[model samples]
Target chain A: KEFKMPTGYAGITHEMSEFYEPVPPVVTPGTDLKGGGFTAPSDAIVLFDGKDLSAWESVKGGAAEWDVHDGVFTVNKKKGDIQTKQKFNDFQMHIEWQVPTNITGESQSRGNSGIFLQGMYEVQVLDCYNNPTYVNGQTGSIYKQSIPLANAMRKPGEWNVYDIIYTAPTFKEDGSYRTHPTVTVIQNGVVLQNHTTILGTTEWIGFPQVKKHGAGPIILQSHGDPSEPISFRNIWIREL
Target chain B: KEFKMPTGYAGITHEMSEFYEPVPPVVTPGTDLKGGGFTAPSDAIVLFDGKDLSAWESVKGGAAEWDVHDGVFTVNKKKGDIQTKQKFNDFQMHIEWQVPTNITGESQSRGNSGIFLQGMYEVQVLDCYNNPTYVNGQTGSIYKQSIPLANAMRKPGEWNVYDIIYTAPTFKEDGSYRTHPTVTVIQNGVVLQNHTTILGTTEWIGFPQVKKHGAGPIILQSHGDPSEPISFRNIWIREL
Candidate 1:
């Protein structure tokens, strides 16, 4: 049955209502799995079940070059960037990451990585607890394009979750933007970006600008910074 | 007659020995000014004097545009940078600054200022008491070229003295560096930078590079950050 649109909501689009949509009630996952009485939806595709890297591949299209042990995988500096084997256009992604307790280096060189959506747009990840770097390049930033409202970093060695909702940009035939991409990020359960607009792809030396592209794989950067590599676990994505 | 170079110090040039030179003793001035049993040398040039900004001029070479009150002067963000009336090639300088108890902002935006020796080499002045910024841009750093050996910042609202010895870089006739400049800084009696080399000029947008120049005025930056401006008092300098 088709649900009737609420009255007095003229000119309001479905996207607007879905933005503030309430979470539907669901049954808790059965015990023996542990903590917080939570579970991934039956429809959600589990990217990393904390067991293996079968669903991932390297940027060079070879085997994922990383260490997987004890239900987590860590980036091996020798091996470069990694990406999911599958590609998605718009989706909800959840990732759990931790910076090492003995992490070294200062600023961007310390525990630096990124969660690149569509192999182009990036959301920065770094150890920023009482550690400072450029605002737009710190933890929870849109990597040189946008700075977070506040730093919501857990202490080094503590696990933190990134809950991200991304909507891909639509482009016209001439490569001009029909609608700029938008993202809503919650870091450690605190809302950092409230559906913020993405200027364009991230860059280290230039201002953000438009680039025509289609849906791409999720890329995890293996920044060649001197600091110790970081680790990740329990990654999942739900295509919207 | 020229003074003979000290024995056993052969090949250790006048610049080298003086690089680690100690602060000389001086008789206390007659009562009038108040502090912690402190007084300037007889030949010292008083910059602030806790009276007015007569000894200073705007960076653009006009009246200084900061507030003078309670025997102290505070930077007025709209007024802009200020500099000493007299220029010096190399010298010993002492200045006391205080970050207000009622301060605002975070990281580099807090109590941001610079004590620019020769109006080129910057020794960053920041409230780093429990606050963190890029290592090379933190308090006592030769801004973007070196980091402080340690963080020796007093609490906000407390006066902090910077005792600095600046040795200006010598340049060849062709505008290339003959000898790199070096600086030794003591913050509140604790040494931070011990004769650290100045890579060249301080910059925010690019790498440090050398430029041919002569004696230049000492500049006190009035940073346009969104925070309460800092206060300064009891400034004095002595020629080497």
Candidate 2:
């Protein structure tokens, strides 16, 4: 084969080269995708269509077995974490969750769980109504990265909604960061996190550490905490 | 006697004159001066000594008929407002209040009352815990003038403390404002209003109008709201 050179100058180097770009699979809108006057757009990938957990699987590699009844999916305490079987990069997501009315415990011991992005960075999920905990670990917080602008938790048993827009971090060929990820989250109808940059991967024992990776699945932590298990429904995502 | 040449330029118009300055009466400390580890300083005038309502009287000029029991005075519905018999100008005040544990109603209808400085500018008193009302009318708000920086209402039935510093307004000879009155309010150990300027006399209707006046009494309203009455205790002030 003859060698080729671009008119601009030197050929592409490993530092400035293209990488794999996987296209998200297209799915038809299921009939049960309507919820609370909100209907998923025709192009959106319905993660949980208020019908079943067919789109999800256990993070430990098997069929996801969480409790699902009357269009609601609740945490099944002892089982491992569950995540979307399909992976994604940049996307917009909507999720609705509610703490059990008969919740018990206080602070971090109260209804603790998390919605982790790319199975790494977490947006904490907890019952913060009249409950005090570390600000960075409160409901709607970005794990230990950022505290929400306000605590917008509804009363236990009342529904709360979270709308999130996530942008994935870009990485160089040598597994170094090119740009950090950023997220914007609105809880209920209030703006909580506004275009906050993620420090790196979320951690409980130490600070966030950069770990290079590509598209990853969405994770819902089956937190081993002794607090009452929380429930979720109406989860949908739109890849951008 | 030349009268010292009329002190130079022949001044002494009412516009640039000194008005009467009366000295406050001094009283020996009463034996019941201690209250929950808080003692009114020797210079502070005890408005409510928990012994009796001797320092206060009904605004209509009779005995203040509020219910006094167990070192606290609770609003007697339909008894009308009450005011300190001893009037003051600029002063620092401390008062503790509690809403009945069995409070009822919502919004402005819940535990509605007020602490009016100079019987003119009102600092609102209401049960705002987990209850949403107009920001400018919520607890610690400057009545219709300024909204509090935060809602610092403790749980109903729990005693909430207020420490207020007030500066009286100054007026020109023509009765126009030279400086507006300003107030700083700390509620439950939180600074709710910090040196906020009062817009003028607080009024229920129309704009705040400047009314020229001298010293006035501290008045507590007996609100006619259908909600249960609120209570007050340890009321004292230090004239500055």
Candidate 3:
């Protein structure tokens, strides 16, 4: 059946205008690293404002075991992990870390660290440049869980950036899969992961495991593997 | 049993440095418009090069039917729906659309138009200004399939913009679901949707239905509704 063309206006039959058009400009090259002039969203917590790490505390029940100097903080080896005293839900986090150029180990032992999103799920931080390691457990990996979309790692001595967009999972009363956690990661400003869903919480050795927890602190794992000191700085997070 | 630190490196110490900080100016406000740029990656497409309609044709007759003049083209309403002769997989498209301000119709009946991704999944383009309509069927909507995240439509007369980033869905040989198409849309520079998933192909009657299809053209709907002529111009796209 033919439909009627109901009209309430007039126009030049078969007319057009270019008042608005898709005009794209030349893009700068990829290596042109530029920064400065963005105010972190209001909901963000500036973890290390290039000033202090008061937001973190030593899990060892004393002062923060990590060393904070020259706008960088180093973990106090064997002092246990550290975490943000504050908790967060869905968020966008920015942080940078580096493996010591003079490291004496390979794989998991090199630049070994992890960022626990909800105090439970760990996104492994490792120095996997040319170093051999389990693909799913390397730099930019979701720690013993999902592997990264790309291997965008800096050399051993260079710093690496991690811009993470995370959505926490919810638990059902029956302890079954309720909500799946999804994460998007940009390593050194390059998209290596595009909002991939995590099967379950990341565990060192196990299948899918579900644990219920509310808003939790951002825990930094103190991987006990012997390697050079792993440094971190300029941490910040904005709750979605 | 106790674990020993690795062989030739210092104990795993945590350190922080502010060297790689994303200084203030690195970020930019993200857009939902069909072809807007953000702090991240963004691109535009050149649909026409002032040459031929060889890139488009009537979906019904398989011939170019749009009226081209003034170095631009206008859709021929009587020709039914027309689609881009070229097909795309994943892309970000930017196109400008506007309803004749003189029109006085309401809701879907006023300047109702649509831009379909893969000639199947549509992101509705209609004049929704002061006109009231169902949220999921209004301008910047995914037809009756998905509601926009926010109402970001400009009035009828103003040239409105749609910047869409689309991720095409994967298909299963058995005609079942494999992957769902996702889109992020910004209407007139305002965010209408942020990377929302389209469950299936959009529909007007029964629930949306999904079917497997290969790469397809971009379709422009012949809404058949009597309304003002919705003008489109400056359309471009970039394959992802």
Candidate 4:
């Protein structure tokens, strides 16, 4: 008898390779599954309170020109990713976003975006429902450095929430990491990155290598994907 | 050098054994993560619609005696498990539940319950947020047969959601499974059991062994654990 390499990641014999094209919102009340309209808590610094992006600026060095309308702001293709005007140390943040219901393409091309902490470390935002790709680059991941614990994706059209708890890195005088940064990413009520220790920065090619930095602005990547662009609303941050 | 057993599964060395005591609810509004107050879609068969348990009955052969108040029904300790009065074949279901904030005890003893599809096959429910337990019997798992893809447990106090898509089993003439029962357990938007095949009834001892049965009622377990009881609300099912 020949021993075959099992499919999927473990003892579970079922192939975990099923793909789902963009799809609907299965809203269940009673659970905090839909964070689409939650009012900002008292302590949070309202970032994009569904009206304007006054608290943000384009990473391209000018006013953030993302599309804002009907209490939601969308990623304007080629407008460049945006970042918060104010910088912070450790913080807790709430972000709400959604890939277009009519999303297209595959892999990284499908509803790609990212939330970069300190404008360096990236927590991926992608449509990974049934879609498969490099595990570390999928939604909820720390880009190429950390693999999210699970895939907590709702369909493309529906809203998704991310509650991020971050602790910044402490740097040494020599510009190397004294203590690494750690983040807890809760997406749509599921814990994706559980207090994960981030390596260097989330890099495209090589270097998350050793760079020193202090409290930095939060960056949202306007990824260069051709799929239907996603939307954002109710972004609030609470300094810790 | 002597080899030591590694902690957690996979290359991630973080010990998967962590315990979170019962706690507060983190409500992020954008995602369907909060289904606490979701209005039942027009097509769904409203079961426990926040007012009554008209769609259920006690498996012990009488009227269901679960506590119903404030649009929620709780497991009444000695009342036995309850089942949907109307049996079904293939279906989609939404269930919202939460272990009380002050839940106590350990493993199966802490807020344990089960949603038995077809009145036999069990999807174990328990507080597993930092709390550790046998993987196959944890929340979102198919009792002893299938392991959930991940631990999607929120803290005890938070309302958790389960959007289940079930395909009932086809039995062979001789009380054996022909094409086994398959269920997709999406808890808190995380795909726990992704169309997993149920070998047999979720058992306590040695068997999920072959058993013959037809379309059966959905059963909500009144687990005999001596801990704080969990509550359930907004349960609705759609025949697919």
Candidate 5:
């Protein structure tokens, strides 16, 4: 089912108006959902209150994948990818994810998962809070693609937020990119990378590339592994 | 006359230590030096103060060729560079400089100056607040030499601090550099360069190269510009 805003979603401020303040060291935190003093311009759309999964669904159309408990969700081991039932174009988003601290494995296998934008382009979400993986595919990675300017991962179990402002690419009649995509992110409030260019949707084997598509949903990879369970909360989005 | 230290100059910390916190964001009624912070390793040597200039002298002899007034000193536009009367090897230095914000000039000349370690090797300190200049010669530029990792600067008139941790070059029995010089700098709390290697002393219009020498004075450049009256304060150094 396609997810749409509730009748009174717009009236809801405070929480969705802004997110969390940039933690220690940042003079000001961009956490205010209302969005005021910060660099660049961004907007959020859906507001997932760590509670209902009604706003999202599984790519395979099953029980919307993953385990939801206490206003929080963790990536299910090998549980096929999941995405928002709703689709969108250019937008800004703020979401928090966490990986098990007492990790058992090492490198990519230890804590591996990703957030696929529009359910197509992927901006990796791994336990890159520290433990390094392949430089290119490391945390904040565009998954098998662009490397993050910096890694601002919170300690394991310590919730970390990814504030992403993405402007989608424009396509031509021949199914080529009319304009390339760009993204700016503040992980936990620190500007790791200023507005950087996104080459193509993330790929695992070859180079990233673009494909024709309409508005799409946001997806989360499962990557079968019980050693590290990534948790997410305070999920919200704004459309520009 | 040597400048004196402000009251409570040593052992001072910011009231707040979070990211993006409001700066002394304003100039209170009587709070002149109530801005910025200072710190040092367990070992460092105190250099100058707002009260005296005894630790330094003009490269041309006599007292340092500069003007001292109202707890601040404005370098006497050129007349060669001035230096600390003392000699040191490896050290961590905390110095502050302010370029002529009101001056109208092109890049490299508006507020040009430099901080030389051992009276030879330099850490370029020009007015790089918002003004754009050549990449390798802008504020924080190691002159026409090394490029800083980032350009971290404060607006002119706003006190900006340079926390430089320098490891001097080591020499071999044949009088050649055994170890190249390296430096780490935090300008006004923002990291400009993190433990970067030096190509040798900075050159104004040539390539950088290391030249071995004994310990020397900490020097400050006085670039001649009728409008570029760069000011200095809270200058201090600690030997390692």
Candidate 6:
């Protein structure tokens, strides 16, 4: 079952924000790159379990329009991104996403998407296997701000796991960050960002800038990359 | 007191074996990559505890000539690689290594040492941060055979930990592997190779080839990389 987002949340989604520079190094994986199918921790929040998008809303306001079936949700290319209705400050999140096996494209035009932390910084989501792009904009990177420690991309069509541990940024009265946000991104059991600090708000065409904000929703980008839309499943979050 | 190998293990140490091809992608590490200083399990065999290489022997036969001081051992590049006097079948090992902060050179010419499990298959141990070489021969790889799952490299001069869980290969009567060796490599907490099966004996100039063998010692390569010699400390192992 799917539900409407009810009303659009202001400034929660950015349409077609893209950047490419200083591409991260590629790591051709072992043939035995194992797959993950984990059960959430008992105290975690199950956001998506193939049942419904009740906890999500389209950035356009009303309902989340993504296609949901077979225990997963596929992005609707025409629709904008969606985000959690509930807001979080600090969190540990687990998400699984997969690229279509028959996908076609190169560079950022491939399976491009992202998960925005607090609707600001993006952990890039792209199909990086045999695909070269700007390292800082590649999969597992902190979009334009930090290059991932590695490219732990499994083959296309295989589910990849992301375990993100995030600490929220605290701001000063002058609208500048007092303590910058820090994140640890582990994809498919490999640590990509080992408690790396986020420089500032992730930008598409410019450098990151710090702007004051409070507890924010998690945004899933509906990217405009021309390749086949990707799928996400088994999403859960533990507030810290 | 240091010990000797009693006799040189024939066909173990290959002098100046080198290959340069299919360079691995370079990963420019974040400024905040965390350092690791792990204590081995209670059941572990402390090989080099900063005091001496009592558990080690020179690859040429007697007395490990590696520089041991300040709670670490520096490789003696001219004396060749060293090995454990005791042979092991299957085991878990934890080793910490550090690269010189003032290192130079690029690709395989940098700090390009390795750890040979079973004195056969080589798990590469290069200084890979911002360094590019073949992915299958980069840090944490099974040289010339399998590329790693990720590049969890920290900044130079930081201690990097490798936690290796190895399963011994069983061979058939016809001198071929009946059951291939498998390994899980975690570097500084990032899973690099998750239960990756070793293809065969590691070669410097050719593809990996399976050779029938039994319980073997662990060899630490005193690589001929010209940049600068690396250091190692807190080496420990546990037989399974």
Q: Candidate 2 lDDT, tens digit per residue, B139-179?
A: 88887567776665667877776767788999999998899
Give the higher-lDDT candidate: 4 or 5.
Answer: 4
* Model 5: residues with Cα > 4 Å off, grouped in runs: A1-240, B1-33, B39-44
lDDT of 5: 0.63
**Tens-digit lDDT track of model 5 for A1-240:** 859644323354322322122211212112222111112112234346656678878788856777889778877776677788888787667677767667767666767777788877777766654455665666665665455555555567665556676678888999988887776554553343345677776766455567877788888788776666777776666564
Off by over 4 Å in 6: A1-34, B1-240
Single out the weakest 10-residue window by summed lDDT for candidate 6 chain A. A13-22
Question: Whose TM-score is higher: candidate 2's or candidate 5's?
Answer: 5
Chain B TM, cand. 2: 0.84
Best by lDDT: 6
For model 5, residues B47-161, the per-residue Cα lDDT tens digits are: 6567778888888888786888877788786567889888988776778777656756766677777888888777777766556666766656555555654555666777766
**By descending TM-score, how would the candidates be arranged?**
3, 4, 6, 5, 1, 2
Q: Model 6 shows how many backbone clashes?
A: 16
lDDT, model 1, position B76: 96
Q: What tens-digit string does per-residue lDDT give for candidate 1 at A1-240?
A: 859754323444323312111211121111112211112434457788678888899999888979998888999988999999999998777787889899999888899999998988889999887677777677777887677755666678777667677889999999988998888665653445556799888876455668899989999999998898899877877676
lDDT of each: 0.74, 0.74, 0.66, 0.74, 0.63, 0.76
* Candidate 6 C-alpha lDDT tens digits along A1-240: 758432223433211121122222433211121244344544567789789899999988988999999989999989989999999998878788999999899978899999999999999999888888777778888986677766667778788778687889999999988999988776664556666899898876554677999999999999876789999988888676
Runs of candidate 1 with Cα error greater than 4 angstroms are A1-39, B1-240
DockQ, model 2, C-alpha based: 0.01
User: iRMS for all predictions?
Assistant: 25.5, 29.2, 15.8, 19.4, 25.7, 22.9
TM-score of chain B of 3: 0.79
Q: How does each model score on TM-score?
A: 0.45, 0.44, 0.55, 0.51, 0.45, 0.47
Compare candidates 1 and 3 on TM-score and give the better one.
Answer: 3
Q: Which model is ahead, 2 or 4, in terms of DockQ?
A: 4
Worst 10 residues of 2 chain B by lDDT: B28-37
Writing each residue's lDDT as its tens digit, candidate 3 over B1-240 gives 769533322332211111122211111122222222222222334575344577677887677777766545666678778888789998767677767768767767888889999988889887766666766777777877666655555556555666676788888889877988988775543445556888887766455677888898899887877775676665666575
* True-structure RMSD, every candidate: 24.0, 27.4, 11.4, 17.3, 21.4, 25.9
